[PDB]
Design a protein around this motif. Structure first.
Motif, PDB file in Angstrom:
ATOM      1  N   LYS A  32       3.826   9.742  -0.291  1.00  0.00           N
ATOM      2  CA  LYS A  32       2.924  10.147   0.765  1.00  0.00           C
ATOM      3  C   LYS A  32       3.375  11.537   1.155  1.00  0.00           C
ATOM      4  N   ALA A  47      -0.959  12.778  -1.945  1.00  0.00           N
ATOM      5  CA  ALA A  47      -0.036  11.936  -2.661  1.00  0.00           C
ATOM      6  C   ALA A  47       0.541  12.797  -3.741  1.00  0.00           C
ATOM      7  N   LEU A  94      -4.697  11.956  -0.491  1.00  0.00           N
ATOM      8  CA  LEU A  94      -4.173  10.670  -0.045  1.00  0.00           C
ATOM      9  C   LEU A  94      -5.314   9.727   0.312  1.00  0.00           C
TER      10      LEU A  94
END
Ligand SMILES: */C=C\C(=O)Nc1cc(Nc2nccc(-c3cn(C)c4ccccc34)n2)c(OC)cc1N(C)CCN(C)C
Ligand SMILES: [Cl-]
Length: 283
Positions: A32, A47, A94
Motif C-alpha cells: 500500500k 500499490a 490502489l
C-alpha cells in the motif's frame, strides 16, 4: 485514434513511498503506497509491486511495461508507473476494497445475486477487451480481480508473466495449476480460450464465496482428474443455467468453450433477473 493516449511513466524513488505490506510472494512484495507526481502537490493512493531483483534486462522490461500501460478499459488495471533504479517496481492505482477472493470470503453472508452476477459481467468485459487487443492474461483468478467499489471491479496483473521473464532463476525454480486449462498444463499453450477456462474457475470461486478449488486433490493429481472428466462441483447457489456455462469453459476442446463476447451477453441476461439464476438466502 485520439491524440491523447495513456502513457507509461518512469518514476523516481523520491516520488513514491511504501506504507504497508499488502501481499507477498516469490515474485516480490506488494505495498500500500503513496505517489506524488514530481513537482506536483497531489497524493495518490497506489500499490507498489517490488520484484526480488537486470540492467541489461531493463530494456526488455520496459517493452513489456509499455503494453501494460496501454491497457484502456474500466475493468482492467492499467500500469501507471515503473521505477528501475535498483530493482523493478510497478506502480498501479490502489483498489481500496482489496481483491474479490478476500471480499467474497469476508462478506459471504451479505452478498446478493445481483452483485455476483454483475462481477461476472465486468470480468468478462475486461477479458473481452484484452482479447480484442490479442492479449492473453494467463493468470485470471479471484485473487487477481480487485474491487474499486462493490459496483466496479478490475482485472489485475495482466502481462506479469512476461515481466517475470526478465528470469533464469524463474525458470530454474511455478504456475497456478488449479486455475489452468488442460492445454496449458500439458503443453504450456496459452490462448484467450485458456483464459476462458480460468474465467470459469474464477466464477466458481465467486459463486462458492471463496472456496479453494479441488481442495482434497493435490495439484499433481489434477491433470489426471481432468482427463478422467472430473470438474469442480456445482455451487449450491447456482442454478443449472449458470453451472452449464461454467462447464462449457472447462471443456477439453478449446474451441468448444464460450467466447468472452458470449459470456458478457449470457451473464448480462442473468444479471437482469438475478434471483432466477442464483438462489441465495436473504436475497
Ligand atoms: C487477494 C489479496 C488482495 O489483493 N488484498 C488487498 C489488496 C488491496 N489493494 C490492491 N490494490 C491494487 C493492487 C493490489 C495487488 C496486486 N497484487 C498482485 C497483489 C498481491 C497481493 C496483495 C495485493 C495485490 N492490491 C488492498 O488495499 C486496501 C487490501 C487488500 N487486503 C485484502 C488486505 C490484506 N489482506 C490480504 C490481509
Ligand atoms: Cl488462499
Amino acid at each position: 485514434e485520439a491524440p491523447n493516449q495513456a502513457l507509461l511513466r518512469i518514476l523516481k524513488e523520491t516520488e513514491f513511498k511504501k506504507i504497508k505490506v499488502l501481499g507477498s510472494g516469490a515474485f516480490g512484495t506488494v505495498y500500500k503506497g503513496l505517489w506524488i507526481p514530481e513537482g506536483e502537490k497531489v497524493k495518490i493512493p497506489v500499490a507498489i509491486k517490488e520484484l526480488r531483483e537486470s540492467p541489461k534486462a531493463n530494456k526488455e522490461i520496459l517493452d513489456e511495461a509499455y503494453v501494460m500501460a496501454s491497457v484502456d478499459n474500466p475493468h482492467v488495471c492499467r500500469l501507471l508507473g515503473i521505477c528501475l533504479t535498483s530493482t523493478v517496481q510497478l506502480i498501479t492505482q490502489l483498489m481500496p476494497f482489496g481483491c474479490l477472493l478476500d471480499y467474497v470470503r469476508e462478506h459471504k453472508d451479505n452478498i446478493g445475486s445481483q452483485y455476483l452476477l454483475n462481477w461476472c459481467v465486468q470480468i468478462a468485459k475486461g477479458m473481452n477487451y484484452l482479447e480484442d487487443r490479442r492479449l492473453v492474461h494467463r493468470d485470471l483468478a479471484a485473487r487477481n480481480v480487485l474491487v474499486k467499489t462493490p459496483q466496479h471491479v478490475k482485472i489485475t496483473d495482466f502481462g506479469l508473466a512476461k515481466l517475470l521473464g526478465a528470469a533464469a532463476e524463474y525458470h530454474a525454480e511455478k504456475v497456478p495449476i488449479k486455475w489452468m486449462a488442460l492445454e496449458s498444463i500439458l503443453h504450456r499453450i496459452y490462448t484467450h480460450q485458456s483464459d476462458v477456462w480460468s474465467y470459469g474457475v474464477t466464477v466458481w470461486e465467486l459463486m462458492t464465496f471463496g472456496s479453494k478449488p479441488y481442495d482434497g486433490i493435490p495439484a499433481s493429481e489434477i491433470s489426471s482428474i481432468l482427463e478422467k472428466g472430473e470438474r469442480l462441483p456445482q455451487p449450491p447457489i447456482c442454478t443449472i443455467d449458470v453451472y452449464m456455462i461454467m462447464v462449457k469453459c472447462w471443456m477439453i476442446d478449446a474451441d468448444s468453450r464460450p467466447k468472452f463476447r458470449e459470456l458478457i451477453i449470457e451473464f448480462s441476461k442473468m444479471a437482469r433477473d438475478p434471483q432466477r439464476y442464483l438462489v441465495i438466502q436473504g436475497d
